[PDB]
Amino acid sequence: KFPRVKNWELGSITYDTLCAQSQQDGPCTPRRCLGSLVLPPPAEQLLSQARDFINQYYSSIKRSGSQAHEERLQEVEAEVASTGTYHLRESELVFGAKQAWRNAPRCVGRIQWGKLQVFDARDCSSAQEMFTYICNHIKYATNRGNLRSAITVFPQRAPGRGDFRIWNSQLVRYAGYRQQDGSVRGDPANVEITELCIQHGWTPGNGRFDVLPLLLQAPDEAPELFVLPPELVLEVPLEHPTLEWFAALGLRWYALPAVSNMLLEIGGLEFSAAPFSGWYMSTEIGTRNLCDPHRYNILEDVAVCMDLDTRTTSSLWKDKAAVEINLAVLHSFQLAKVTIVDHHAATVSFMKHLDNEQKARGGCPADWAWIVPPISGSLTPVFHQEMVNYILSPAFRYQPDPW
Amino acid sequence: GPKFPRVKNWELGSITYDTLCAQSQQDGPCTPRRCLGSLVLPPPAEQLLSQARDFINQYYSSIKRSGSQAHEERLQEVEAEVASTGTYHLRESELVFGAKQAWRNAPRCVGRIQWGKLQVFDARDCSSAQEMFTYICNHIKYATNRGNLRSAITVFPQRAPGRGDFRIWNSQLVRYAGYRQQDGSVRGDPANVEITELCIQHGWTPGNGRFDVLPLLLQAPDEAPELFVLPPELVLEVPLEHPTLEWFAALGLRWYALPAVSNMLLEIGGLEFSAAPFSGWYMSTEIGTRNLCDPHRYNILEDVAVCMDLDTRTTSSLWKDKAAVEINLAVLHSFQLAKVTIVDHHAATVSFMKHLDNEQKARGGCPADWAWIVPPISGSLTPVFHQEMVNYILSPAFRYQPDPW
Ligand code: HEM
Ligand code: HEM
Ligand SMILES: Cc1cc(N)nc(C[C@@H]2CNC[C@H]2NCCNCCc2cccc(F)c2)c1
Ligand SMILES: Cc1cc(N)nc(C[C@@H]2CNC[C@H]2NCCNCCc2cccc(F)c2)c1
Ligand SMILES: C[C@H](O)[C@H](O)[C@H]1CNc2nc(N)[nH]c(=O)c2N1
Ligand SMILES: C[C@H](O)[C@H](O)[C@H]1CNc2nc(N)[nH]c(=O)c2N1
Ligand SMILES: [Zn+2]
């Protein structure tokens, strides 16, 4: 009835009973698995989601069934009945945000889930204020290189109006400029957003690592452009511990991974602007951002710099160059005293997390394809661990781009 | 718009719809509530007859004769045979077609570009364990072809009502012994502890090496299994050395040339071939990454990183990554030197991408298990990482089956 879950390195077996609390369907059916795909109210429905969540919260503070619990449930019924919606108390918001992260199946960093600074920005009435709030988040989370996990939560969605939105997918991204010759200068994943910025008045640069401005949108208004002060945006120059020529490549990356386009759902309420950040796992930069062929695509350049036989696949020049780039990322971050975790350290700590969650909740939703690192997969323990994937609430979700 | 899974490649930005999955008639382990895709392991006349009809229809379509009187006569022949015996039998060319189709249908195989080139050995006349041995030896000889490896399958008689199965007890035709030591550790391949112990229980005099080739335990219907040692001259092995690291040869590592799965059930039109060993050639990561570096296999990563003088005390030196790359390269280099067919994970995956286009055009999709198709080193460096895949069961199929003991 409940799925048997095996680790193939150790022979150990658990049963996932947590998955029974999923109320939201994923993409798979018995006929076909779609788990490798990247992408996919009325009163009584919102109310039942609100109840579930208030239940979750009072249980977390061990006050299940108490007066404060009963009274709070009534406040929610009263507010929904009269207004079609309700509001969270700060402490509930805090619990909700932590729980959304905990429940994130694609996140390998979840051992940190209980350590999250939550800035309540629900008294935000303008794109200008959104910016102040965004800048403080960056200041806090960066902390001179000693990164701290943080989320800032802007005003929820409301029936009769447009959303607060951050158009950018992260608070910090590098520009991608489409050239007339069809090639991209900069980061190719950011061509569209670079263009949008330009359309809304941004004076472009012409470098490979021009940090983008933020397009911020208050309800039903044109987005506004804000340039981040360079002082707030910590970058790390890339060098290699043994290869001197590496630094000459002029490669660099920003310190702060902060997602800014995902919706945060708590008890049926929706937070369309709720950016969050932690710290990088080196492979995100060393492997995906720098080596993906549809990103900076630096493999060949590096392999040529290493004088590798680039003529045949069997020389494993791709694999060899990839390792040095991952090493350069780690070394550079360690040298600049900026928090990073390598994919071995990270997956080992995720295994501990799976164990903690088994005892705590009877399971952990996890998306195997995203948990296993993009290089050296079977060299990490998560490769050998079976995983059950499902949707729990509170959750982060994708939402449509606002343009 | 289309009411079929949309499939995107994120490298190239291109889109397809899988319409083939509509043909699936066996449910996998996933529900809308939870995805179980990462789990390794998750007759009556009526059921048999419909399975048969569908296979026969598959066969006649593949020769472009759907609806023809030969098609409808063969259907008639099939039901009349089930009507009177409870089973039926495949024509020679129906077996050949079904064996290839089963390979083509296997979601976990990255080598499927090759699916149309399979030598199908018909061994449905086989009536003893001794004869299975002869057939298996002939299989190994033909498939090995002195290192110019050839895809092949040998098909032994089908499961019958109230008669024992033909079974090969070993999971592969060639595997190394794993000896459980006095100190609890394992000498040889830890994956093969059980089969080694079974071999010894059935009178095998064991060796004491890291790379001892196992004997076969072969079972004819309703008999105890008989033990057969493969003549060593038949078992091509490759000594492992590295192109520039001179000391690697001194580790004394080696692997067999021929990957030959022998414990899977080949199902075709409801008929069950309990003994149908099939063989191809290796993708290099199978040996160099999994068999050699898995913690629960040979586990040689630390040894090699020490030899390479790496800092094995800290994760962030990427010592595991560095050694793994060299062990893989050693595998490739050694097989190439020995003139034994092998394919690297870059070529293999590049060619599977091409197989995906072929199949899109031919069948409207291709069942694929992303976790198994993506190699265990350098995942996102290969194009399959960036390709969404739809996984589902088609028949003919290879299936896991329970161990005979
Ligand atoms: C503390 C350090 C953290 C590390 C090392 C980490 C690691 C990762 C990695 C490697 C991914 C996959 C990213 C990709 O391949 O694009 C990921 C995804 C994700 N993380 Fe974490 N994470 C951390 C903190 C956080 C925090 C603070 C939150 C929210 C409060 C969070 C929520 C998520 C979500 C929702 C995803 C999947 C959404 C997406 O990026 O598409 N993580 N994480
Ligand atoms: C021609 C060269 C071939 C290559 C390079 C190749 C490659 C692979 C690889 C890398 C795997 C995953 C194995 C693992 O991780 O343990 C696999 C699985 C599989 N292969 Fe192929 N293969 C080839 C030929 C064949 C042939 C001839 C057949 C059958 C006629 C076949 C049928 C299968 C099946 C059924 C599986 C899944 C069963 C399992 O779990 O091992 N392959 N193949
Ligand atoms: C908090 C935190 C820490 C960390 N290390 N890492 C993260 C997420 C990663 C980082 N860097 C990008 C984020 N992940 C974004 C994943 N993209 C979704 C796929 C997609 C969908 C639609 C369009 C498109 F182009 C792509 C968060
Ligand atoms: C024909 C061919 C060519 C090739 N390159 N490769 C192959 C399959 C590989 C080879 N070498 C092992 C096979 N595959 C092993 C299948 N194991 C998964 C299920 C299972 C079941 C029981 C125990 C266990 F640990 C795991 C076949
Ligand atoms: C198509 C496939 O699902 C896609 O490439 C996924 C695979 N696993 C991933 N895993 C992580 N962490 N990040 C990713 O972007 C992806 N991409
Ligand atoms: C848990 C996970 O499914 C398991 O370790 C799988 C992952 N992918 C694999 N892929 C291949 N090709 N071979 C394997 O043995 C595995 N093991
Ligand atoms: Zn699934």
Q: Give the C-alpha separation, B27 to B394, whole Å.
A: 10
DSSP per-residue string spanning B346-396: HHHHHHHHHHHHHHHHHHS--B--HHHHS-SSSGGGSGGGGB--BB-B-SS
> Which residues are within 5 Å of ligand 7 (an ion), measured at CB?
A 28, 33, 35; B 30, 35, 37
Q: Which residues sit with their C-beta closer than 6 Å to ligand 2? A: B 103, 106, 108-111, 114, 118, 151, 153, 261, 278, 280-281, 283, 286, 343, 348, 372, 398
Residues 36-55 of A with CB under 8 A from B: 36-38
Specify whether B326 is catalytic.
no
The question of whether B197 is a catalytic residue gets the answer no
- B189 CA to centre of ligand 7 in angstroms: 32
Sign of the four-CA dihedral B383, A282, A98, A226: negative
Helix, strand or coil for residue A271?
strand
Instruction: From residue A209, give the alpha-carbon distance in Å to each of A254, A382, B98.
Output: 9, 33, 55
**Phi and psi dihedrals of A49, rounded to 5?**
-70, -40
Strands B216-219 and B15-17: unpaired
Residue type, A198: I
In whole angstroms, give the CA distance from residue B53 to residue B373: 32
C-alpha to C-alpha distances, B15 to A39, B315, B387, nearest whole angstrom = 13, 39, 10
**Chain B residues lying within 8 Å of A29, measured CB to CB:** 30-32
**DSSP codes joined into one string, B255-310:** EES--EE-S-EEEETTEEES---EE--EEHHIIIIIIHHSTTTT--HHHHHHHTT-
- Could you tell me which residues are beta bridge partners of residue A266? A269
Question: What share of residues in chain B are helix, strand, coil (percent, to 5)?
Answer: 40, 15, 45
Beta A117-120 vs A235-237: how paired, if at all?
unpaired
Label the pairing between strands B152-155 and B278-279.
Answer: antiparallel
- Measured CA to CA, the distance from residue B107 to residue B389 in angstroms comes to 10
A144 close to B (CB below 8 A): no
The string of DSSP codes covering A152-170 is: EEPPPP-TTSPPPEE-SSB
Where do runs of H (alpha helix) occur along B22-151?
A: 45-62, 69-85, 92-104, 129-144
Please check whether residue A390 is in contact with residue A26, taking contact to mean a CB–CB distance below 8 angstroms: yes
CA distance A398 to chain B (A): 17
Radius of gyration over every alpha carbon of chain A, rounded to an integer in angstroms: 23
* CB-based contact B378 A25, cutoff 8 Å: no
How far apart CA A56 and CA A69 sit, in angstroms, is 11
What is each CA distance from A378 to A54, A329, A382, B308, B393, in whole angstroms? 41, 21, 8, 21, 25
A378 vs B18, B294, B329: nearest CB: B294
User: Distance between CA atoms of A96 and A99, rounded to whole angstroms?
Assistant: 5
Q: CA A226, A227, A233, A236 torsion: positive or negative?
A: positive
- The distance of Cα A350 from the centroid of its chain, to the nearest Å, equals 16
Nearest chain A residue to B33, by CA:
A25
Between the CA of B36 and the centroid of ligand 6 the distance, in Å, is 13
Q: What is the dihedral of CA A97, A100, A104, A108, to 10 degrees?
A: 30
What gap in Å lies between CA B67 and CA B60, rounded to an integer? 8
- Pairwise CB contact (< 8 Å): A35 & B34: no
Distance, CA of B373 to CA of B73 (rounded, Å): 41
Residue B35 assigned ligand-binding role: yes
Locate tokens 């303008």: which residue?
Answer: A126
CA-closest residue to ligand 5 atom 9? A370
CA of A319 to the centre of ligand 6 (A): 20
Residue B201: Cβ-neighbour burial (10 angstroms; 0-12, 13-18, 19+): exposed
Q: Which residues contact B82 (CB under 8 A, 6 or more apart)?
A: B45, B48, B49, B52, B88
Q: Up-side HSE of residue B246: CA atoms within 13 Å toward CB?
A: 0
Instruction: Specify whether the CB–CB gap between B389 and B355 falls below 8 A.
Output: no
| Domains, chain A, ordered by start | 16-122+149-159+263-277+347-371 (3.90.340.10), 123-148+163-234+398-402 (3.90.440.10), 235-257+280-345 (3.90.1230.10)
Residue type, A24: Q
Residue B337 structure tokens? 């030197």
DSSP A337: T
For residue B301, the chain A residue with the least C-alpha distance is A379
Could you give the CA distance from residue B291 to residue A384 in angstroms, rounded to a whole number? 13
In the DSSP assignment, the letter for residue A288 is I
Residue of B166, B123, B191, B174 whose CA lies nearest to B264 = B166
User: Which DSSP category does B156 fall into?
Assistant: P
Q: Where are the beta strands (DSSP E) in A318-357?
A: 340-341
Q: How far apart are the first and last CA of chain A?
A: 44
**Tokens in use for A45?**
């429905």
Integer angstrom CA distances of residue A58 from A45, A120, B130, B226, B402: 20, 20, 71, 66, 48
| Ligand 4 centroid, distance to B286 Cα (angstroms) | 9
Candidate from A313, A342, A375 with C-beta closest to B380? A375
**Within an 8 Å CB–CB cutoff, is residue A289 touching chain B?**
no
Instruction: Name the residue of chain A whose CA is nearest to B4's CA.
Output: A32
CB of A382 within 8 A of CB of A351? yes
